Amino acid sequence: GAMIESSTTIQVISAGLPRTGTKSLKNALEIIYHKPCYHMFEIIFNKQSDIIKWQNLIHDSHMITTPPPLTTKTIAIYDKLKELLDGYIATTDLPTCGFYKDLMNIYPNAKVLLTIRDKYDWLHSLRKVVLPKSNDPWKLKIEEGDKVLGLNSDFYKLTEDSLKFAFQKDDLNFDDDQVLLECYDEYNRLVQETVPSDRLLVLRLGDGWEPLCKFLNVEIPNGIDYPCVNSHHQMTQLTEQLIKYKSLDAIIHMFPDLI
């Protein structure tokens, strides 16, 4: 196809939850658009200063009144969300995904994705990477590796609070598998009930380039396979290597596309 000059603004809002292919989608969107896509890894690697800003935004998010129409308090909140996302062409992952309805208002010409997968595979992946149970010894290795990156309790607070916001819960028993599974199913159901189908594409792990590129009116990137990154096995290796070498920069060349 012809090359066209794309606008550097949010063009794709992905409502999918963590551990549903968000990093592969981030990479895929950057391959298509040649500009950055937001993801938790963007916070970790480039924008740790944004942690407190997302936390403040979630703390105030209860004061959003669902437009239309648009109130003054909502506008203040929307301006800070637009500020956080300046320079990016898409959103994925926590902390953004729970804001999908508000992002649709701010970027009315953006299209919406939902990444989904088997609920038990999701929970297993989540327990291995994001939210190990309190008495799981792996949780201590996770925390040891994360300190190497400069991640502290405020990082974990943002994950917890952005998950609570996505699930619209005032509190959450993070160690309760039944609660998390029900929240996952209800969240994915609600996205599909809220977003007009003309503006939504539901992606399953393995769908690849074709449905995504058709939805976005772009050619399939030639000779580039659809990304497959961020498996829990890979994350386990990264945590262990962070622990062993005590720096990211010592090991970064061993994780090329993930990072």
Ligand X SMILES: Nc1ncnc2c1ncn2[C@@H]1O[C@H](COP(=O)(O)O)[C@@H](OP(=O)(O)O)[C@H]1O
In angstroms, give the least distance from the CB of 236 to ligand X.
9
Provide the 3-class DSSP secondary structure of residue 203.
strand
- Is the CB of 57 or the CB of 126 nearer to ligand X? 126
Residue 83 has a CB neighbour count (10 Å cut-off) of 11
In angstroms, give the least distance from the CB of 150 to ligand S73.
10
Check residue 27 for interaction with ligand X (CB under 6 A): no
Q: Are strands 90-91 and 37-38 parallel, antiparallel or unpaired?
A: parallel
Sign, CA dihedral 182-183-186-191, equals negative
Interacting span for ligand S73 (CB under 6 A) from 41-49, 100-108, 167-175, 186-194: 41-49
40, interface contact from ligand X, ligand S73, none, CB < 5-8 Å by kind: ligand S73
CA 66 – CA 89 distance, rounded (Å): 24
Check residue 41 for interaction with ligand X (CB under 6 A): no
146, interface contact from ligand X, ligand S73, none, CB < 5-8 Å by kind: ligand S73
Check residue 22 for interaction with ligand X (CB under 6 A): yes
Q: How many CA atoms lie within 13 A of 131 on its CB side?
A: 21
74, interface contact from ligand X, ligand S73, none, CB < 5-8 Å by kind: none
Residue 23 has a CB neighbour count (10 Å cut-off) of 26
For ligand X, the binding residue among 11, 125, 162, 188 (CB under 6 A) is 125
Inter-residue contact 11 to 17 (CB < 8 Å): no
Looking at residue 146, its amino acid is: D
CA 142 – CA 140 distance, rounded (Å): 5
Check residue 130 for interaction with ligand S73 (CB under 6 A): yes
CA 95 – CA 74 distance, rounded (Å): 18
In angstroms, give the least distance from the CB of 188 to ligand S73.
16
Q: By the criterion CB under 6 A, which residues form the site for ligand S73?
A: 18, 22, 40-41, 44-45, 93-94, 129-130, 142, 145-146, 149, 159, 235, 238-239, 259
Q: Residues in the site for ligand X, rule: CB under 6 A?
A: 18-24, 121, 125, 205-206, 226, 228, 230-232
